[PDB]
Amino acid sequence: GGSTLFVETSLRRPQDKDAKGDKDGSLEVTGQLGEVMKESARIAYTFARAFLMQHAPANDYLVTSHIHLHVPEGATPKDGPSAGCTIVTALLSLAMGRPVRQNLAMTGEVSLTGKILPVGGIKEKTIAAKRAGVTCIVLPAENKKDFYDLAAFITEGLEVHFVEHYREIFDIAFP
Amino acid sequence: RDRMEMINVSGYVAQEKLAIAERYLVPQARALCGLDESKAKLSSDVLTLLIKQYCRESGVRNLQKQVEKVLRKSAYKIVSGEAESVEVTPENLQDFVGKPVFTVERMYDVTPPGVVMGLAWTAMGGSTLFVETSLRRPQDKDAKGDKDGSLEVTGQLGEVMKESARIAYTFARAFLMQHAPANDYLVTSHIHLHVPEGATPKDGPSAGCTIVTALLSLAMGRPVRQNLAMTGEVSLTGKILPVGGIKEKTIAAKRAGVTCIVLPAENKKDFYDLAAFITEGLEVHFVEHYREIFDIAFP
Amino acid sequence: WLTSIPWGKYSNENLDLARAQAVLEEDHYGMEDVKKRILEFIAVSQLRGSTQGKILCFYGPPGVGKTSIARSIARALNREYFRFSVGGMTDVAEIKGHRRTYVGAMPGKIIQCLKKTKTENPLILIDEVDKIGRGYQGDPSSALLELLDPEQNANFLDHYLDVPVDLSKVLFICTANVTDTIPEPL
Amino acid sequence: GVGKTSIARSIARALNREYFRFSVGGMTDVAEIKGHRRTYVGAMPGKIIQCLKKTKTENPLI
Amino acid sequence: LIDEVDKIGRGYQGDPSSALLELLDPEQNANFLDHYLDVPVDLSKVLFICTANVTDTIPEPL
Ligand SMILES: Nc1ncnc2c1ncn2[C@@H]1O[C@H](COP(=O)(O)OP(=O)(O)O)[C@@H](O)[C@H]1O
Ligand SMILES: Nc1ncnc2c1ncn2[C@@H]1O[C@H](COP(=O)(O)OP(=O)(O)O)[C@@H](O)[C@H]1O
């Protein structure tokens, strides 16, 4: 089936090792990391750093701070990378401390520049999201058509969203 | 390996695939389903649409699955449905095969700075893999800082690929100082690049040249010219080296819509061995020293 | 063992489409994709004279009704039903038997299926295909592919009974909760 | 999906010598190609011997 | 009354867990057969009881 796994992140060591210290914010990934998962997490970390740079260069928390993230397991390896998009926003949220808009589910594949990629098993994730009660589902634009193949009665009560560049997501999660 | 000689059996282009489908696969599946030629009509336009939108890969079996599906549905609509002879038209196709999966898309039509295409001879055929580059940590470590821009390669690096990437990074630095000494972004800035996998290790270095140009783009922030591909290997001096499997990369580039293919000069003859009908509409290039590429990609 | 195997005996197959559709609709609500797929299969098989057995693999979460729908399909199509488990299986002999020179050799379990079913065109159901290990001394995936091989099935032979047996009309079905771990050749 | 085995089959037909496909990929035990010692209970010969027997010819297209 | 079900190793040359799954099967038990007496035997009315010190190590299909 599908599940609503809660990806999360938090600071795990003080950002102020030294007021002048330029050491990068090395990231630790847990949750039975797979090599592909480790690389996807690193890609998401770099993209989040770049996005925070572009948006608010004043903030450097994510730039220099050691952050621990937990991605609960259960996802098969093939779709494992699908959660990466969430990871990104998580870090960004933790970068600004702004809670993500309530009951906002999402998934996608980032490619180090924000151009989201399609993911598989869209129907299972959709039914799991409906069960969880979430109202907004953010999916890659490529998978858009696939979500429309779903029977009508399963898609009621949710404001589906389609996107290809992660920029759009940042404008929906954080108004 | 050394005990026999090897011939390169390789895939078919959209036109060749359409010919294969119409002349051999379609009648074969029709016989294997029993439907009469007049009863079921499959216009070559529908086959072209199916190949272009649904079945996109070097192989052909997927098109066989699609044609089997549509023929089975036509038989279903004939045996107990209303039409005695199903006329499969593109407008009707939507109901038979459903909405078109694998819709045509180039991954980056804009191709922002630091990203560029590359024709990689993957394990199954060839693909137009996108090499990405991006700043991953601020250039302002220190206003007086002299620390180099240590690079962090990703994408299941192979030790051979690690060495090739290091050589490409060094050559890119040398070229940047040679052209614009005032510029020092790439000289002192930690940059993360991603090279998508699927390329066989033997062809791994074939994308090294791409890496270089990508970095150069990020150095000047100039997007590479639209729909431009390239491949080859560098030897720390810009002297491009030949690469193999040119036909698969060429057909992949043709399918992807990229118009300009840049190849090592030595491979030129191997590219002319290819059939003429596969080379239409592309502005191929032949070079041996990397310098010329820098001019073509950045006019 | 040899004379107990049915030969040339083909259980009568249903051709009425409305009756089969109603039968299936009265057994499992919804799931209309599978229902329409099997309806299309029935229609195409009816149109092309004889009925062939093509392979398909249901896949989805567990408890969804994949075995129940297999039984419903077997009932509606009018052919014999039989279930078979392969998940975590390692000793190809269970599908191939033994050379018969043993002190207590047995034939593969597929010949047992043919004998019990009393028909040469039953519906064989394969369970937990993706769980095959193909580990040491085993590798039943090779013989399993042989079963699904579109042409070798027409002359499949087991180690105990080495006479080739046709398996083209048998309607195989496979069940797995995920399509990843299943071997690509299969 | 290029038809490599398909062209092999076509070549077998045109050349008129008997055809036979062989899948060695992933094979672990060499005994399949070499059989067994024939003294073990159930020992059987190599798969190539079975191919020769079934093909009924000494010059097939393996 | 089966005892210490969860202690089954299901190891080399063995795998009695498959035999158990066959026995506990609600319908296959109705025609269960052994290698010695191959005649099917009905086991629908037999009320099996399984005892285990923990529910984890026991096989999931079981
Ligand atoms: N239309 C239906 N919708 C949902 N469940 C059903 C339906 N028909 C039968 N079932 C249930 O499905 C169960 C069978 O699960 P199944 O999917 O066969 O498991 P497995 O994944 O092991 O094959 C039965 O217990 C039955 O109660
Ligand atoms: N040029 C062609 N014309 C017609 N049919 C073809 C052509 N090439 C391949 N096919 C068909 O496509 C299928 C490809 O399968 P094949 O490539 O032989 O499998 P594999 O990739 O495992 O060797 C074959 O069944 C063959 O009939």
Author numbering:
A (entry chain D): 774 to 948
B (entry chain F): 650 to 948
C (entry chain D): 464 to 649
D (entry chain F): 526 to 587
E (entry chain A): 588 to 649
How is this structure described in the published paper?
One of them, ATP-dependent protease Lon, is a member of the AAA+ family (ATPase associated with various cellular activities) and is responsible for selective degradation of unfolded, oxidatively damaged, and short-lived regulatory proteins, which prevents their toxic aggregation. Functional hLon is structurally organized into homo-oligomers consisting of six identical subunits. Following its mitochondrial localization, Lon’s NTD specifically recognizes and binds protein substrates, which are then unfolded and translocated into the enzyme’s proteolytic chamber formed of the ATPase and protease domains, where they are degraded into small peptides. In this study, we investigated the effects that phosphorylating two Lon tyrosine residues, Tyr186 (found in leukemia cells) and Tyr394 - the only two found in its NTD - might have on the structure and function of hLon and the effect of polyphosphate on hLon’s stability and activities.
Other hLon mutants were produced by exchanging Tyr186 and Tyr394 for glutamates (Y186E; Y394E), thereby mimicking the negative charge introduced by phosphorylation (hereafter “phosphorylation-mimicking” hLon variants), or for phenylalanines (Y186F; Y394F), which acted as non-phosphorylatable controls (these mutations were introduced to verify that the effects of phosphorylation were not due to the loss of functionality occasioned by the removal of the Tyr hydroxyl group). The same approach was also used to study TFAM and the most significant digestion delay was observed in the reaction with Y186E, where more than half of the protein substrate remained undigested. Compared to TFAM digested by hLon WT and Y186F serving as a control, the delay caused by introducing a glutamate instead of a tyrosine at Tyr186 site suggested a considerable change in hLon functioning. In particular, Y186E is still able to degrade β-casein, but more slowly, while it loses the ability to degrade TFAM. Cryo-EM maps were obtained for Y186E, Y186F, pCMF186, Y394E, and Y394F with resolutions ranging from 2.9 to 8.5 Å (based on the 0.143 cut-off of the Fourier shell correlation curve). ADP could be clearly resolved in the Y394E, Y186E, and Y394F structures. Structurally, only the pCMF394 substitution had a large impact: the cryo-EM structures of the ADP-bound forms of the Y186E, Y186F, pCMF186, Y394E and Y394F mutants were all very similar, while the pCMF394 substitution destabilized the formation of the ATPase-protease hexamer. Tyr186 is, however, surrounded by negatively charged glutamate and aspartate residues from both subdomains, putting it in the middle of a large, negatively-charged patch. Phosphorylation of Tyr186 would therefore place an additional negative charge on a large group in the middle of this cleft, which could force the subdomains apart, thereby interfering with the proper binding and recognition of Lon substrates.
